[PDB]
Design a protein around this motif. Structure first.
Motif, PDB file in Angstrom:
ATOM      1  N   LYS A 193       0.657  -1.191  -0.123  1.00 48.84           N
ATOM      2  CA  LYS A 193       0.037  -0.076   0.190  1.00 48.84           C
ATOM      3  C   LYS A 193       0.851   1.370  -0.009  1.00 48.84           C
ATOM      4  CE  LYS A 193      -3.544   2.344   2.757  1.00 48.84           C
ATOM      5  NZ  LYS A 193      -4.851   2.129   3.706  1.00 48.84           N
ATOM      6  N   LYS A 194       2.058   1.112   0.683  1.00 50.13           N
ATOM      7  CA  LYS A 194       2.862   2.396   0.798  1.00 50.13           C
ATOM      8  C   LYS A 194       3.539   2.524  -0.482  1.00 50.13           C
ATOM      9  CE  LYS A 194       6.612   4.186   3.716  1.00 50.13           C
ATOM     10  NZ  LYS A 194       7.652   3.913   4.739  1.00 50.13           N
ATOM     11  N   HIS A 195       4.152   1.662  -1.060  1.00 51.70           N
ATOM     12  CA  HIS A 195       4.918   1.750  -2.138  1.00 51.70           C
ATOM     13  C   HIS A 195       4.636   1.257  -3.751  1.00 51.70           C
ATOM     14  CE1 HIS A 195       8.402   3.058   0.421  1.00 51.70           C
ATOM     15  NE2 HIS A 195       8.015   1.835   1.095  1.00 51.70           N
ATOM     16  N   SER A 196       3.472   0.581  -3.776  1.00 53.81           N
ATOM     17  CA  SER A 196       3.232  -0.092  -5.017  1.00 53.81           C
ATOM     18  C   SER A 196       1.743   0.120  -5.376  1.00 53.81           C
ATOM     19  CB  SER A 196       3.503  -1.535  -5.024  1.00 53.81           C
ATOM     20  OG  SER A 196       5.108  -1.574  -4.648  1.00 53.81           O
ATOM     21  N   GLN A 197       1.112   1.389  -4.698  1.00 54.91           N
ATOM     22  CA  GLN A 197      -0.234   1.536  -4.836  1.00 54.91           C
ATOM     23  C   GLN A 197      -0.746   1.815  -6.352  1.00 54.91           C
ATOM     24  OE1 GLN A 197       1.918   3.542  -3.640  1.00 54.91           O
ATOM     25  NE2 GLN A 197       1.098   5.525  -2.820  1.00 54.91           N
ATOM     26  N   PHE A 198       0.164   2.244  -7.412  1.00 51.88           N
ATOM     27  CA  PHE A 198      -0.311   2.675  -8.648  1.00 51.88           C
ATOM     28  C   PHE A 198       0.139   1.700  -9.447  1.00 51.88           C
ATOM     29  CE2 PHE A 198      -0.023   6.829  -6.053  1.00 51.88           C
ATOM     30  CZ  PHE A 198      -1.462   6.874  -5.855  1.00 51.88           C
ATOM     31  N   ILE A 199       0.589   0.303  -9.089  1.00 47.79           N
ATOM     32  CA  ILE A 199       1.103  -0.713 -10.222  1.00 47.79           C
ATOM     33  C   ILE A 199      -0.161  -1.199 -11.059  1.00 47.79           C
ATOM     34  CG2 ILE A 199       1.996  -2.857 -10.288  1.00 47.79           C
ATOM     35  CD1 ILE A 199       3.993  -0.980  -9.748  1.00 47.79           C
ATOM     36  N   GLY A 200      -0.070  -1.249 -12.316  1.00 44.53           N
ATOM     37  CA  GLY A 200      -1.263  -1.607 -13.244  1.00 44.53           C
ATOM     38  C   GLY A 200      -1.659  -2.818 -13.538  1.00 44.53           C
ATOM     39  N   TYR A 201      -1.279  -3.732 -12.401  1.00 51.39           N
ATOM     40  CA  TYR A 201      -1.756  -5.152 -12.809  1.00 51.39           C
ATOM     41  C   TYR A 201      -2.094  -5.535 -11.352  1.00 51.39           C
ATOM     42  CZ  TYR A 201       0.851  -4.889 -16.949  1.00 51.39           C
ATOM     43  OH  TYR A 201       1.449  -4.359 -18.164  1.00 51.39           O
ATOM     44  N   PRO A 202      -2.945  -6.674 -11.109  1.00 51.44           N
ATOM     45  CA  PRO A 202      -3.602  -7.234  -9.815  1.00 51.44           C
ATOM     46  C   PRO A 202      -2.279  -7.880  -8.990  1.00 51.44           C
ATOM     47  CG  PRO A 202      -4.352  -8.298 -11.659  1.00 51.44           C
ATOM     48  CD  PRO A 202      -3.581  -7.339 -12.040  1.00 51.44           C
ATOM     49  N   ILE A 203      -2.001  -7.478  -7.838  1.00 49.91           N
ATOM     50  CA  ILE A 203      -1.176  -7.988  -6.812  1.00 49.91           C
ATOM     51  C   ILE A 203      -1.985  -8.648  -5.935  1.00 49.91           C
ATOM     52  CG2 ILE A 203       0.643  -7.374  -5.117  1.00 49.91           C
ATOM     53  CD1 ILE A 203       0.900  -4.540  -6.572  1.00 49.91           C
ATOM     54  N   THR A 204      -1.713  -9.974  -5.765  1.00 54.84           N
ATOM     55  CA  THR A 204      -2.567 -10.902  -5.036  1.00 54.84           C
ATOM     56  C   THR A 204      -1.634 -11.457  -3.882  1.00 54.84           C
ATOM     57  OG1 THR A 204      -3.994 -11.597  -6.762  1.00 54.84           O
ATOM     58  CG2 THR A 204      -4.014 -13.091  -4.843  1.00 54.84           C
ATOM     59  N   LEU A 205      -1.838 -11.024  -2.600  1.00 55.17           N
ATOM     60  CA  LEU A 205      -1.099 -11.514  -1.223  1.00 55.17           C
ATOM     61  C   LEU A 205      -1.602 -12.912  -1.125  1.00 55.17           C
ATOM     62  CD1 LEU A 205       0.869 -11.639   0.598  1.00 55.17           C
ATOM     63  CD2 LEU A 205      -0.208  -9.830   1.837  1.00 55.17           C
ATOM     64  N   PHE A 206      -1.149 -14.044  -1.377  1.00 53.78           N
ATOM     65  CA  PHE A 206      -1.593 -15.034  -0.789  1.00 53.78           C
ATOM     66  C   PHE A 206      -1.327 -15.306   0.665  1.00 53.78           C
ATOM     67  CE2 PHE A 206      -1.021 -18.502  -4.739  1.00 53.78           C
ATOM     68  CZ  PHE A 206      -1.189 -17.465  -5.676  1.00 53.78           C
ATOM     69  N   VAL A 207      -2.351 -16.220   1.363  1.00 60.71           N
ATOM     70  CA  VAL A 207      -2.194 -16.303   2.863  1.00 60.71           C
ATOM     71  C   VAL A 207      -1.853 -17.775   2.956  1.00 60.71           C
ATOM     72  CG1 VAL A 207      -3.625 -14.655   3.741  1.00 60.71           C
ATOM     73  CG2 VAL A 207      -4.712 -16.502   2.667  1.00 60.71           C
ATOM     74  N   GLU A 208      -1.441 -18.201   4.252  1.00 62.57           N
ATOM     75  CA  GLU A 208      -1.147 -19.406   4.694  1.00 62.57           C
ATOM     76  C   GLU A 208      -1.930 -20.128   5.284  1.00 62.57           C
ATOM     77  OE1 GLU A 208       3.446 -19.261   5.437  1.00 62.57           O
ATOM     78  OE2 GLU A 208       3.046 -17.251   5.466  1.00 62.57           O
ATOM     79  N   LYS A 209      -1.824 -21.508   5.251  1.00 64.33           N
ATOM     80  CA  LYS A 209      -2.733 -22.267   6.225  1.00 64.33           C
ATOM     81  C   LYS A 209      -2.413 -21.905   7.662  1.00 64.33           C
ATOM     82  CE  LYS A 209      -2.687 -27.097   8.199  1.00 64.33           C
ATOM     83  NZ  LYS A 209      -2.534 -26.529   9.773  1.00 64.33           N
TER      84      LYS A 209
END
Length: 209
Positions: A193-209
């Motif tokens: 959110k701080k540094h990559s908020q305007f990247i024009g591709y979906p950024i998906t943060l995976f979660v862990e079990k």
């Protein structure tokens, strides 16, 4: 069958500076790798505008962030243009010799390590947080390869027998023992959110079990 190469002296110097300089603002590594992924995605998108078959290897253009606390790895996956074997050997598709020259003048002329991406060598900021980096890549015009380095002046390249990728690049950061905050969901979200908020591709943060 593994080939071992020496870094050019200037790139070895860049890496030792990144590893040895006291510099607390390590989180910028993630901005730099996501920016590299965005650049790679732009390249395959541009090629596809005049040749749709360039996306036969995968139509989705995206960036995945995959933390794994058991392996102590953070993996940045993109479906960009990827890299040929020659690209990997030639400093992962960068003009790193001239880029390093400019960066190191800037550091003595005022600048700090966070400005690294302005000189085209932001990939190497991975060594702010990783003891080892593995890069798996697939370009439409070549086979799937794995590059790897723990710094120390050498890197390896081998054909990758692992999970086929289709097209793109995977940067696997084997994190230093004291850098595991970058596996925590809330920390990664904060940095994106701080540094990559305007990247024009979906950024998906995976979660862990």
């Amino acid at each position: 069958e593994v080939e071992t190469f020496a870094f050019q002296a200037e790139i070895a110097q860049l890496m030792s500076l990144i590893i040895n300089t006291f510099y607390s603002n390590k989180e910028i590594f993630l901005r730099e790798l996501i920016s590299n992924s965005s650049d790679a995605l732009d390249k395959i998108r541009y090629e596809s505008l005049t040749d749709p078959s360039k996306l036969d290897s995968g139509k989705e253009l995206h960036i995945n962030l995959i933390p794994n606390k058991q392996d102590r790895t953070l993996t940045i996956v993109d479906t960009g243009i990827g890299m040929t074997k020659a690209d990997l050997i030639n400093n992962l598709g960068t003009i790193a010799k001239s880029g390093t020259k400019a960066f190191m003048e800037a550091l003595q002329a005022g600048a700090d390590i966070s400005m690294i991406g302005q000189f085209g060598v932001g990939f190497y900021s991975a060594y702010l947080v990783a003891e080892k980096v593995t890069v798996i890549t697939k370009h439409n015009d070549d086979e799937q390869y794995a590059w790897e380095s723990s710094a120390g002046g050498s890197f390896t390249v081998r054909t990758d027998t692992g999970e086929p990728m289709g097209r793109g690049t995977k940067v696997i950061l084997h994190l230093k023992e004291d850098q595991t905050e970058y596996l925590e969901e809330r920390r990664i979200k904060e940095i994106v959110k701080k540094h990559s908020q305007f990247i024009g591709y979906p950024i998906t943060l995976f979660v862990e079990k």
